[PDB]
Amino acid sequence: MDTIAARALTVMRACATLQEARIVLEANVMEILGIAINRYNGLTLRGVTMRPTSLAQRNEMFFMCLDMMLSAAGINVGPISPDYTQHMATIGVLATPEIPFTTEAANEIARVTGETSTWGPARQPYGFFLETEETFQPGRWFMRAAQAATAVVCGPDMIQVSLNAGARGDVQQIFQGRNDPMMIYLVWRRIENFAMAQGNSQQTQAGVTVSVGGVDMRAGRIIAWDGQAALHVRNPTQQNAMVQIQVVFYISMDKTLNQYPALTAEIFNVYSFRDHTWHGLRTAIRNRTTLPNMLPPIFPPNDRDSILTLLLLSTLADVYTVLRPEFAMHGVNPMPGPLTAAIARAAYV
Amino acid sequence: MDTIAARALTVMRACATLQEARIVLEANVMEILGIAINRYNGLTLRGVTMRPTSLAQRNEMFFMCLDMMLSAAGINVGPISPDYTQHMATIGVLATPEIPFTTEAANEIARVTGETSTWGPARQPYGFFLETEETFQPGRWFMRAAQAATAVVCGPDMIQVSLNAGARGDVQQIFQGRNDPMMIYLVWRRIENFAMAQGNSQQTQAGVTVSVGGVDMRAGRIIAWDGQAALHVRNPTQQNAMVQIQVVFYISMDKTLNQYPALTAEIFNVYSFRDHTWHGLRTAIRNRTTLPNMLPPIFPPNDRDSILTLLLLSTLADVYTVLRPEFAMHGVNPMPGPLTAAIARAAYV
Amino acid sequence: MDTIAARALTVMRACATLQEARIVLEANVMEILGIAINRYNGLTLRGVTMRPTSLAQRNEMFFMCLDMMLSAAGINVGPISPDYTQHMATIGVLATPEIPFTTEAANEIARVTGETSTWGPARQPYGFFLETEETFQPGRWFMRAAQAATAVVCGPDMIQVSLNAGARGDVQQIFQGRNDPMMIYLVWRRIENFAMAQGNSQQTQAGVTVSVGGVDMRAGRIIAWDGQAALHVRNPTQQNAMVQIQVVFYISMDKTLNQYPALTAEIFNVYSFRDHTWHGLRTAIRNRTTLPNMLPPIFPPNDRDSILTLLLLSTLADVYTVLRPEFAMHGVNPMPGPLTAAIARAAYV
Amino acid sequence: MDTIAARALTVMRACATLQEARIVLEANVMEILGIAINRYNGLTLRGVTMRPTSLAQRNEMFFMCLDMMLSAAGINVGPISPDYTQHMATIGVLATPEIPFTTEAANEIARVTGETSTWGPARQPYGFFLETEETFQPGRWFMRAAQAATAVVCGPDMIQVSLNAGARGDVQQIFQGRNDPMMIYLVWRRIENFAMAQGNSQQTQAGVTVSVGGVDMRAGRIIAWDGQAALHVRNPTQQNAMVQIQVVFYISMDKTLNQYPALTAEIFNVYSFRDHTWHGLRTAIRNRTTLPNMLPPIFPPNDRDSILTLLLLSTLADVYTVLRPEFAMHGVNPMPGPLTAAIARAAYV
Amino acid sequence: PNDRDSILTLLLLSTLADVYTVLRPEFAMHGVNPMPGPLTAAIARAAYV
Amino acid sequence: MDTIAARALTVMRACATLQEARIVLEANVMEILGIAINRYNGLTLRGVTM
Amino acid sequence: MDTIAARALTVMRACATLQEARIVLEANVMEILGIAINRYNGLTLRGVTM
Amino acid sequence: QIILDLKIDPGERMDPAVRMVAGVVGHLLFTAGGRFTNLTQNMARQLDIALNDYLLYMYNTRVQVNYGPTGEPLDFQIGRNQYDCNVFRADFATGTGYNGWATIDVEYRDPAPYVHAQRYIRYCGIDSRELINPTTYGIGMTYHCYNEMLRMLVAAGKDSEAAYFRSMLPFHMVRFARINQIINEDLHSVFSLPDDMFNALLPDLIAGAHQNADPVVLDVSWISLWFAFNRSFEPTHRNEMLEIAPLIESVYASELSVMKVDMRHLSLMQRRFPDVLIQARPSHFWKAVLNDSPEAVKAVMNLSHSHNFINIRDMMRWVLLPSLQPSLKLVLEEEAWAAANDFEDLMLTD
Amino acid sequence: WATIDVEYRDPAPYVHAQRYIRYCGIDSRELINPTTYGIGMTYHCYNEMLRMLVAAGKDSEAAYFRSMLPFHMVRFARINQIINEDLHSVFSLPDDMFNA
């Protein structure tokens, strides 16, 4: 199954090599396309040439890459063009052991299937306290009735504790319950000049401390916090104190954009316009998937099929560029050949 | 691709034909297996016998069906057993146009792909107002302030309207917003004896009329409501009246357990225990899928892949039964003591 | 006549086998279609190929399936398409003895003609007291003037008897006169806490007994009742009591959805959309029958012609899926797009 | 043993193909019946012809199907007819390995013996609280002495908890002890308007919370509850609150009507009338079994012999339909007048 | 990191990881007790000391 | 030294190409695994197969 | 035009393969460089070794 | 493996006696059996027809001839009891008319030498494991197909002709019992075909689709059919190669693997030393292997290579196939190659 | 019939003709080093020819052509080599006139 995708990928990446037609080829390439196109026309009965020149010859090849790209992603787009017709037989071609697939492609697949099937610690994208409803003003005093120490959020990655002269207390609960972090990197600083409930300026004195699991930590230094340990803040000073603890970043087993090498740019390539014919195509394809047909998912996928598909498409995209195919698509209307940033804007619904 | 799955199915169904050692086979089988087995061992190099008698020969054949089953689905189980290893090449064997499939299996797939690709109207399994947060006592008066007519829920498939003497009004808005019905089947009645705001018994005088889109409707008769027409209730009676409207059943496009013939029976056959070896197998297999590994899906699936997988696994289950395969599996510790309902119960997490 | 219907089904199911162009067919299939198409083209004068490839060859075959599907169900659709014209000679082909039929098809028709020509006991779908006009609040005291015992409906499958201290009496009459049950399964409970005519809570003391045809039955156990025997309720207790008798389910000789194996799915299949060309074709065919042209019959049909039709259409629907025919239909303006859940919804009037 | 059963089944379904006299048979069938009959007439000395025409030839064939049907089910009906003498040696014929069986027949028996020998999770047909002796008024307040929270049943699938202002407590025990559930699917709502101990209307304020095993759950959402976790309800509101919890459906390892594909439809086909000759024959057969002789089992069977029997009869039934047998049966008197829904109604004791 | 050996090690290990995946080896390790049951985000979480 | 690494890398990446029993490995891969394994088993006395 | 860049790229990437002698050139590479270097020397008249 | 293909063409094909006779003979001499085939589809069709004519020949007092819906030869049931001769048609996938039919011939006595899927063909159920007579053994022996042949033979026509068939049973059972011992017992060597292929012959023949496993075309005389039915086979004396055979088998086997091995190493020589073999092409390296290896072995291969054609690709596959029969020669060469990887050890340095 | 036999490719040393003929799409290369096995060499037409010979008349002859096939293609591969390699001179003839 993975092997099929690697093969399909190889073939596309290979056709991608055909900018011109006169050129001499890297023998390695010829061998591929030779076996490929041979078996392809054999079962597909189409007329794809290893050496294209016309246009219909170019389209014909692109259609092949499309056929494969789809069979690999396990997609069936149906009637989306009067010119193109997807041959399910394409799968039978890619299943032929005779067809090779670059070492590169094999490792490419292996990596995807690899991480996709397991988890791993990744630097999360946005601030810790992002999904919060209530937020407070930064540098302002606030003491919840009956308490001596009042920890409270005041940013997407910020909190601030309000201590009374001589007060102490754990704070961990303000973080817990949210996400499922494995480690939270903190860095606390003394709010040297904060506002009091009334509006007056107040100073925090040097001596306030913060200890994790019992051990005393410095101010302004990063701190690996397991999220379970005792996040204790003490105020031995004879005055009101206010400090700020910062979740500079954390790590969880949630898939990020760095799950697979430069996935970002790949996605960009897929979601890029090129032209109406492409746009509509790419869209029409993604409609069979769990992916947003024309706008970068806010949340990076996590299943083999998604990632895999993206890659196939990203490649098929370049293949599109080099071959410069020209064909009709139901519901698509090609506005000539100038193309401006504006027209591209209008294409995105 | 469908052809592929059809073949895989045909083979497993053909393997289940092997019940005894010296029995003669149906002409049909010796034509299928003869080819299949040869082509399989041709790319697999395994020793599959047409008439397995030992155990190692039986395990081998089962591993074959397993390979074809997984392949036909597009599953890469990974390291799940020390005795079994998955050959991705099995896909190539199933793509061989030379291996025939049954008419039965042909139509079987055609149905899945056919329905799973489009939508259709179907009787929903649960009550209309099942997803409601608030419910009122059935047969009790309730008039929202300033209103002459007050419609309210009282159950999963029950609503009751409180009308004042000589009052009238529309009720449709209590039904809308929920789901996306195509046709709701109603049957209204009169609450002859209901409790008042204080607790005293009250009577609903005959004469109250419920009209849909204008035309007047009888009580105790099923009504084809389009969900958009005006559901108007009138109380020309000189007393307080309360009438209940029942959603006997409604139809929508969401797939049900009747999208494919006896889908349920199969699902049961798959989720069934048999023994620890099968249990763990079936589980590990679904771990790669979106389907729950050991407890039936709350909501019936809707994609070809899922439906297919189930049918395949169900068939592979029967194959498991007839072959009596014995082999290791990671995390599976077999208990030989005659297997009982009690032991089976425990295995499900 | 039955022989005719089976042949038509055999042929259709056979045409479904043609998923690809170069695939190897079951010797059985070739033998059949070889005779079928040879004789059809003789009395119809059309050009159907065993191995269609173009589109016109595909339509020609589908048209043949349609001609047979109709001849078998005994329908005359008339002028519904400019491309298609129904040949009445098709019935003569389905009667030609030299055209065999499968064992599966024979056993399929024998089942339809079988249960359709006679009756049988089946669990009815809806509640017993569904076709009632008046309903009372569940758990409320209600004593009809001059009676010591008063049974009254309070649900679609519920009734509640109100007994006075030391009162006894028969109840069987509230059930009688409705439907035509052969056995009504019951389960009675003691309403331990009910509301009085005024609103105060009243307890039902243990001792209240219910006896069927003489013998005393326990509370909370299912009771097979023949609907004729004496359903007697006694109250030797010195207080007001209230018990609820439930009709969990009942059996009658009325045909249900379980008259024919997975008839539900077969129906859903026919009532599904696919595309406009299908939608209209299926509708136009049903306009010749007693079946609703585009919405599931609330009541399961019970005549040979009805069921027979559903199956022929369910199968012809599958034949549609595989052949992917394309043709015009009067009044149908096909939207050549990919098709969405929305577009299908709109197609249903 | 299973082989013996599958062979019998195959033969019956094979005989079911004979709908006419001259019709050509699927070469597959000719092989089957050619062998079967030869070895039957040899070990029984009866004159069964492959191509029956008279009537006695048709009967003879049916008696054969019956003999096999019985031998396969392991039944000895005894002297139930003056024309038919059940020759027990039929088992010897069904054991002849030279006799082939269909792939369908194999997979069929493999399924029956498959699930019959093991357990599995089923949706369960009736309500959770169906077997309860007591029931309370739905929506009515009730507070058992000395408690602050009181759970109480109010329907076949309904319960309601009465909470005092500021009360809290576990509820799970009301579900336990009943049946043997693996997973109970819940959905709680707030009874916004309920009756007090006196009758006056009371309101349930928004703030009540129902938590499963510690985690807080929302109202109007289905919840997977294992039945062992803590079903704790809390009322932080300063008023009396009543909530209804619904068991939409639960799962247990108790066999349901979905153990074998379309088991229901098969059952119906057996319990049908056809004519008196059939009726009595079927009854007399079931008198030997643990299955009800003329009324659908209240509870679905769960043993091999049962299910097996049913199927053999269902098939034997269709065999009956096609062959049109006419014979005498002890204690049965045929009424030749056309047969109506009334005549059949009377035959069922 | 900022030293050759570091970066390098990572790359080689990364690759050796993919090799691990495809070859799916099965062997013992001093101090490691493999829990073969299906594997979830939970069991994974645990393993990180 | 860098070469040693580049070689080691190549070898592993080549071993990663084994997703199937398949045989008839692509020229390039076979050639590599061949040369490699031989020199390895020669100095390791272990028995690795292509 | 892009072809031109692809060539110039391939050439450079190929030259990078030439680490420090102890190398057995990837057959493929040899071929390419040779053709290029050859043509280059034929236009540069400079003495480039492979 | 070897089919009894088409039956030649000459105009002697008319001679109705010869033709009809062969039609009957053939339905008992050969297997259209659903387990494996003996004849061509063509050969059979002509047989069924020759048989069809012999039946509705009727030179004497008529019977009852109930013609069937399909004009197809043998769609007629011959009266009295009406034994429809549709069961004597040619259905390969079934066996239906011709020999075997409702019999088991492909059975498996598990342990047996070779493991070349130890199956056993016992013609018409003749589990011939013992020394035959044939004065005895050809007694109460049914064939079913033969038995039903005799019924149809009388229900239709001639007793005088069907009586000759009853009296023939012994002699016919011995020709077959004899065959079994020869096939099964005698020609059981590493040269007799493997089973997964054995089982694939029949279905691939039906399918029409073609793979390597090719049936041999032996064209036969129409009249020879009769002569064969009146000629049983008693083997006078076995081939002198039998006892020595197994040794010879091993010789060939080992020699082959030695070649494989050599090539495995020679192949990689190019990526190994490019500067030396730039002009090297695959053909080169094995032409050198073939050259330095035993000529007798090549000869054996050439039997099907000068007939079938092998591509360098087919050769590589074969080389890469892991299956080698070890001998002294084998292990030594294998180890020589090992030590010989240094190349400084070969005395040629860069 | 389903093949590309006129393959323009590579700049030609001559220039009248830049084309280079592939009868049955078999580049002489397949001789030097195979492309796809020895079993299947079949080009479309010869393949269809076989299918017809079977369906209609007989296999007996189709077998001859089946086994002959390689010999056939080899002959053609050599022919191609000779044409667009061994003998394209000035007198060769421009693609213009060829296509015309």
Swiss-Prot record, chains F, G:
Transmembrane segments: none annotated. It is found in: Virion. Signal peptide: none annotated. The VP7 protein is one of the five proteins (with VP1, VP3, VP4, and VP6) which form the inner capsid of the virus. Homotrimer that assemble in a complex of 260 capsomers on an inner scaffold composed of VP3. Belongs to the orbivirus VP7 family. This is Core protein VP7. It comes from Bluetongue virus 1 (isolate South Africa). The chain holds residues 1 to 50 of 349 of the full protein.
From Swiss-Prot, chain I:
It comes from the Viruses. Signal peptide: none annotated. It is found in: Virion. The VP3 protein is one of the five proteins (with VP1, VP4, VP6 and VP7) which form the inner capsid of the virus. Belongs to the orbivirus VP3 family. This is Core protein VP3. It comes from Bluetongue virus 1 (isolate South Africa) (BTV 1). The chain holds residues 452 to 551 of 901 of the full protein.
